[PDB]
Swiss-Prot record, chains B, D:
It comes from Homo sapiens (Human). The gene is FLOT2. ZDHHC5-catalyzed palmitoylation may be required for the formation of higher-order complexes and for neurite outgrowth in cultured neural stem cells. This is Flotillin-2. The lineage of its organism: Eukaryota, Metazoa, Chordata, Craniata, Vertebrata. Signal peptide: none annotated. In skin, expressed in epidermis and epidermal appendages but not in dermis. Expressed in all layers of the epidermis except the basal layer. In hair follicles, expressed in the suprabasal layer but not the basal layer. Also expressed in melanoma and carcinoma cell lines, fibroblasts and foreskin melanocytes. Heterooligomeric complex of flotillin-1 and flotillin-2 and caveolin-1 and caveolin-2. Interacts with ECPAS. It is found in: Cell membrane; Membrane, Caveola; Endosome; Membrane. Belongs to the band 7/mec-2 family. Flotillin subfamily.
Swiss-Prot record, chain C:
Coiled coil: none annotated. Belongs to the band 7/mec-2 family. Flotillin subfamily. The gene is FLOT1. The keyword Phosphoprotein applies. Heterooligomeric complex of flotillin-1 and flotillin-2 and caveolin-1 and caveolin-2. Interacts with ECPAS. One of its GO terms (cellular component) is centriolar satellite. This is Flotillin-1. The chain holds residues 309 to 411 of 427 of the full protein. May act as a scaffolding protein within caveolar membranes, functionally participating in formation of caveolae or caveolae-like vesicles. One of its GO terms (molecular function) is ionotropic glutamate receptor binding. It comes from the Eukaryota. It comes from Homo sapiens (Human). The modification Phosphothreonine is found at residue 79. Keywords: Cell membrane, Endosome, Membrane, Phosphoprotein.
Length: 111, 73, 103, 73
């Protein structure tokens, strides 16, 4: 029992010290992330937004493209229906930032 | 065994509290762009989670135009 | 019987002392948690909220994605229905914090 | 046996009361952020519990638009 207790004590102390090591490394790491982010103008925010939009589009259109078949029917002066699907995807992609806005309270679009 | 567990738990507390404390000043220096980066990074995971039920859709029927229900196909 | 009683007494006393040991350790542990949390600005709270949102979304969309099939039908100037499912999930995810708020 | 059980129960009372007492000052030093952390940590478990009945859904039928019930599929 004494040997097991010493084993547990030493292994736990070592892993806690390792956790502290990554903690210090990650803190000194994120300080420079903040420093670099401070020097971002509208061009950089636009680049970030346009780099993140395709990923959200993928995550919203991946499950949707699992449908076996889609039937489109038009009548009168109406549209065929492809605009309906694209509008549904785009509406979800544009309402998600507002839903996140409702909780976080920090803007996502500069204009 | 209980003493060993108490020692290791206190060590975890030491380390995790130091982690949170050091991360505090890191978050304190965040501007508008950095918060925007955080939100944009969080967005795809939330979108993937919300869209997961859409995976099991079987068939989609779309109709357009304000007309009667006699034409069919 | 005397031996059994002594066994019970000693084992219970040892385990109670062990419980007290973790108690003291956890108290001294949580004191620093509170101290660290005191130095949190809006950025840190935003990070916590955006780290916890995906987990709630998983826990609310895991059971829902067990449906065998989902049929979507539109008519007129209405939507197809995918926005309906996403809105249902998001509405639950946003009304849960208010329900917890009520208590 | 009863005396032994009384002794061990009193020991549990000693230990658990000391635990609660020490945890009292720990909770006393909680700010807004710490309470927010508690609520956010509690949220996923509650959400998992509430969503458990949704596991057994068989099929979902969704209709949209204010029209008649003659078109069908």
């Amino acid at each position: 029992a004494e040997a097991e207790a010493a084993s547990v004590r030493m292994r736990g102390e070592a892993e806690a010290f390792a956790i502290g090591a990554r903690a210090r490394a990650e803190a000194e790491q994120m300080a420079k992330k903040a420093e670099a982010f401070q020097l971002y103008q509208e061009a950089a925010q636009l680049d970030m937004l346009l780099e993140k939009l395709p990923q959200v589009a993928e995550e919203i259109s991946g499950p949707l493209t699992s449908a076996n078949k889609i039937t489109l029917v038009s009548s009168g002066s109406g549209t065929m229906g492809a605009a309906k699907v694209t509008g549904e995807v785009l509406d979800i992609l544009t309402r998600l930032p507002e839903s996140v806005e409702r909780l976080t309270g920090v803007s996502i679009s500069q204009v | 065994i209980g003493e060993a567990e108490a020692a290791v738990i206190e060590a975890m507390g030491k380390a995790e509290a130091e982690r949170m404390k050091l991360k505090a000043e890191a978050y304190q220096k965040y501007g508008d762009a950095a918060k925007m980066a955080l939100v944009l990074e969080a967005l795809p995971q939330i979108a993937a989670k919300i869209a997961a039920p859409l995976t099991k859709v079987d068939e989609i029927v779309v109709l357009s135009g304000d007309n009667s229900k006699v034409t069919s196909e």
